[PDB]
Design a protein around this ligand. Structure first.
Ligand code: NI
Ligand code: NI
Ligand code: NI
Ligand code: NI
Ligand code: NI
Ligand code: NI
Ligand SMILES: [Zn+2]
Ligand SMILES: [Zn+2]
Lengths: 136, 136
C-alpha cells in the first residue's frame, strides 16, 4: 500500500553482509548521515594509487540506503577513483531526471524507480555522496 | 518474486526510531544474534518491580528482525514480566504450527505469514527469544 518501493532487488541487496565491517588502517574513512530519515554509513577504503582496492561500510539505515551502499561497493571495487566518480555523477543524474549513461551504471539502474519517491532519493544518494566527498 | 514477505506493516515497523538506543543504568541488558541471517539485537530494560517501564534496543538487522523488535517493544511496555512472557510464548506458538491466543498477540498477528519461511522465522523470533532469556 505504500511500501511498493521495496523490490526484490532492493531487499536482496539490503541484507547482503559481505561488505559490512571496518577495514583496519583504512587509507580513508568517511561518515555520512541522511538525518531526514535517520540513515548513517561509514565507508572504509583501501586504494592502490588511483585504484579502489577494497571498500567496506559500517552503520545502518533503511533498506534503500543499505541496498544502495552494497550495489555501490560491488560496482566500484577494482575501479579507479575517476571511474567511481563518473559512476557517482551518473547515479545522481539518474535521480535528478537529467541524462545518464546506462552502460556506466549497470545494475545501479535497478534504483531508477526510487526517483518516484522524492524523500527516498536521499536514502539512495547517501553512500554516493559519501563516496564523492571521500574521493576528493 | 521473494519480496512478498515484506508487507507494508513490516516495512513501516522496521524503520521505527522511537525505541532504538540505549538506556543508561538499565536494570537489564541482553544481547542476541541470528547468525544464519546476520541480525543483532541488544535489549535495554527498566522495570518497576514486575512492571516493564521502558525498553530500547541497539544493533541492527533485517527488516523482519527490526520490525519484530519494534512491535514487541511497543506491545510489552507497561505490561508485567509474566504478561510479556505469555505474549512471547504465544508468538513462538504462532511460528511453529501450534495454537495461540489472538487477543494476547494483537498486532503481533501481522507476522503470521513469516511462519511459511523457516529461515525468516529466526528473524521474527530473535527479539522474543532474547526477551525470554532477559526476563528469566
Ligand atoms: Ni505499501
Ligand atoms: Ni553491523
Ligand atoms: Ni573526508
Ligand atoms: Ni518478491
Ligand atoms: Ni543505530
Ligand atoms: Ni542475561
Ligand atoms: Zn533512508
Ligand atoms: Zn534476519
Amino acid at each position: 500500500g505504500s511500501h511498493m518501493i521495496y523490490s526484490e532487488f532492493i531487499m536482496d541487496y539490503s541484507k547482503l553482509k559481505k561488505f559490512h565491517g571496518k577495514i583496519e588502517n583504512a587509507h580513508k574513512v568517511e561518515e555520512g548521515k541522511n538525518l531526514s530519515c535517520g540513515d548513517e554509513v561509514t565507508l572504509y577504503f583501501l586504494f592502490d594509487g588511483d585504484k579502489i582496492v577494497d571498500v567496506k561500510f559500517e552503520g545502518h539505515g533503511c533498506a534503500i540506503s543499505q541496498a544502495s551502499t552494497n550495489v555501490m561497493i560491488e560496482q566500484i571495487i577494482g575501479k579507479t577513483k575517476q571511474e567511481a566518480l563518473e559512476m557517482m555523477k551518473n547515479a545522481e543524474n539518474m535521480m535528478l531526471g537529467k541524462e545518464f549513461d546506462e552502460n556506466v551504471l549497470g545494475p545501479i539502474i535497478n534504483f531508477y524507480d526510487v526517483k518516484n519517491y522524492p524523500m527516498r532519493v536521499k536514502c539512495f544518494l547517501l553512500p554516493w555522496k559519501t563516496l564523492e566527498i571521500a574521493l576528493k
